Amino acid sequence: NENLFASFIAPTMMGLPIVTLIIMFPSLLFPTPKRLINNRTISIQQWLIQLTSKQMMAIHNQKGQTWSLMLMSLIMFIGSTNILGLLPHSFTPTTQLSMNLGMAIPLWSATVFTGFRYKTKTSLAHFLPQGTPALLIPMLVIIETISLFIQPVALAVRLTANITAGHLLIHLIGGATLALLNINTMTAFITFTILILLTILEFAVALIQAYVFTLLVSLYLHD
Amino acid sequence: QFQFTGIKKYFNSYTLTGRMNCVLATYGGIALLVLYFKLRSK
């Protein structure tokens, strides 16, 4: 009975203040120069694109490369709006589940209607995998279609659910420091747990690779 | 605006499939209906 942890009971509030300012604000962090040589703070933004434009280009190699100049705009928005919110009292728009159901469905259904305007038969004859055995036709095409319509829900809900899960352990491990007016040795160890956990919460960049990329595979496979 | 003709060549290329927010509008507009209904029955 040496080190008694404490807790504080307080509501954890994802309120909704004025959003249409907060969305526009990580656009003005990135400038664009009309010059040949630039000014050594855009120049490391301009290099960072020319890496990861050479990995969502290499797989496709089609005349579906026209689509890929948009997919690098999709990575900078939720790459920024997940990285701004680590600050003391900032607010992330990708916390709320509303816009992510408007980021999945106008993009996911832009893929199944891409081959249906050109191929019209073999896009969803990709439901036929192989040299058909007899015992498992109805067990297959009720499975590979129930794992198609999961994909818009599978794409949006994986983003909202772990981003907000980062924010609660920021509060709760952090709030247990404030309410630790018992023995002062254990206060540092909870603080040292925080400054490790904030390094893990720069996997909010790592979770945007797993949103543009499984949009490519959900584009490359259909087209 | 001139927030159009910089990206107007891009739009009618891919908004043929990309501008299908009607399914988002229908799945949004129906999602409006169940929440006004539960507060009506409280």
Binding site: V19, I23, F77 | -
Partner: peptide, 30 residues
Amino acid sequence: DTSTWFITITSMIMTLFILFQLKISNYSYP
């Protein structure tokens, strides 16, 4: 929290994809 009702943010997201397709469109070649 478990927020509700959704008439908000999603109309203010597609105005943003007129901005990001304006900045990033003026980039250069290696």
